[PDB]
């Protein structure tokens, strides 16, 4: 303060080699101004003192277009490794001097500090800021919460809803669904503007809209089955990958021109979708862009059969069946619309990815290790049934041992020759390994995993139905007849009768008189 | 016996029958081949055969044939082992781990339900 | 302290912050710079790694009789230095011997099965 | 422990001049004659908000230049 009494400059910008990435280095990116570190040093007294200067600019963007609020977000790392002071620091700087001009300020890459809380994934201050109850009447106008009516224990709650849903570009919902790199997204969507609004929008159209595409693909799936099983077989090696029947009763020409179009329509649909995200090649291609990659492989594989009529290759029917098997295999993707089954859809999704890759990478190893070794003794000049024309080379003892997992029939300790008590010794060692030791591993391994995930596995399913619902709206360029909200419901501010709102319900706590209210307490709107 | 039928195995069979048809029709395509089963001029080889050929794969079936079925049987065996990868080592052992979480959750209040 | 496996005083002694300036010189910790919440920590590193015979790392890895070794190596001179030394050469060095034995393994297969 | 069990053996079967300099070397102590004892650099986070008496330098991130 004596330096300020001496006349130190409160507006200085510390540039330089810090505010670096890789936080192993210094990079301590606070916003290069005396005000910025002052709250960050958890020093509320001097924060007040900095506000005592009228020469203090607070507006001013510094290096990455950042004001006081921006880097303020990017130290909010944890509730555990913090006493949660930044929340009330941020609260203090608003009430001391706060305007909407400072809030709506964007940055270098043009990004709202509210949106930054989504991008950084700082959940707890985002838990704050969406509520933002302001109690005092001369500046209640800036709140994100307005008691529409209270009537004591059961109140009409109300969120502000101004930058939440995609009525404008890059709304905060659009980030948190379509963001990578954060493993807090499923937990963050628990919040009450986030949670209930999805349930709201799923109600009026998206419950219907999914079942349309579900039925359209399932009946696509049946038309694939009929033309490729019943009559491909005419006694001639003409390929004809789509059954035509140019004569009367046009069922099979209806079969052809159905299927090609929906495959084409789903190809362009996912082709733009795959243009659109860039994974790190194993995190989101192997949780999120999986079933998108499934579809893109599927539909091209369908239309490739049409290309097999052109020079009439040998693969015309052989390729015609792989799309069929996979075409029923991704109905699994479209069972997310139910309650309990969608919870199983993540149970099929992580166990493939954490457990059985670990299994098969060890399983195939002994499958080759025992495989080649038993293939050495099986030569013997006596391999299988007077071995002069029959088989007995390498894939036999492979399949002899591959069938040992299940019922094989009978096991032969027979004429295989030189020291078969070594041959049977490896057989029983295979049993000791690969039936009683190695198989029962994964069973015990799954049980630990399934209880670990199924306390948060619900939330992951919620993210995936959230992952869907925006895409339908994204492939809805209508005038948005589905009015999902109370619209332009007036604020307390005399000119600001804008900002479409929400109505919600709270229960028994905090028994007190309620000062702030909006109306004369009806339940619905009057009349 | 009363809740596991109702929370767990309906979830199982609704997925189990799906691949049972999905692999079922697909393997029924290659089994035609003009060579279906034992000089296929009077014997069977249409649709319920490869159903029951694959339905018996859950338990001891006898022997598995990688035999004369014809055009590219290394795709035919590829779907067979994919069925093994799915429906014997992945999909079956799901429910076993799924039951264990359920049975401890209920058997602190399961007595009361019997009462 | 390594040989006896007394972990908690070993947890102390590797840190050993000395605050007072006339005898700060004997510490095992020196604030190289601090700048408040994110500091440049610094361990003394004098008898830790095998630059001399029988350093404290060489005991704790090659010691029997103690079932606290895995828990003891959690400590920050112990933990991060292994990750440090694995980075520059030992990630490479293992994969050499891995590849040399795996390609040993294939040459074993060919001459003893084909002809 | 088992990857630690490995890593020393490779170094044990490394009798070179130890080109793999794994450390800040001979970084000076506060003691005026003892400018020895090779050191380490590590990073700590938010606790114990206070003034810091003891320090070594004028606080750069890396070494100067």
UniProtKB/Swiss-Prot annotation, chain B:
Task performed by this protein: Non-selective calcium permeant cation channel. It is activated by innocuous (warm) temperatures and shows an increased response at noxious temperatures greater than 39 degrees Celsius. Activation exhibits an outward rectification. The channel pore can dilate to provide permeability to larger cations. May associate with TRPV1 and may modulate its activity. Is a negative regulator of hair growth and cycling: TRPV3-coupled signaling suppresses keratinocyte proliferation in hair follicles and induces apoptosis and premature hair follicle regression (catagen).
Superkingdom assignment: Eukaryota
Subcellular location(s) per record: Cell membrane; Cytoplasm; Lysosome
Tissue expression as described in the entry: Expressed in keratinocytes and hair follicles.
Subunit structure, as described in the record: Homotetramer. May convert from a homotetramer to a homopentamer to allow pore dilation. Interacts with TRPV1; may form a heteromeric channel with TRPV1. Interacts with SNX11; this interaction promotes TRPV3 trafficking from the cell membrane to lysosome for degradation.
Annotated gene: Trpv3
Protein name as annotated: Transient receptor potential cation channel subfamily V member 3
Extracellular side stretches: 31-42, 69-71
Cysteines paired by S-S bonds: none
Binding site for Na(+): 60
Intramembrane intervals: 43-68
Family: Belongs to the transient receptor (TC 1.A.4) family. TrpV subfamily. TRPV3 sub-subfamily.
TM region(s), chain numbering: 1-30, 72-108
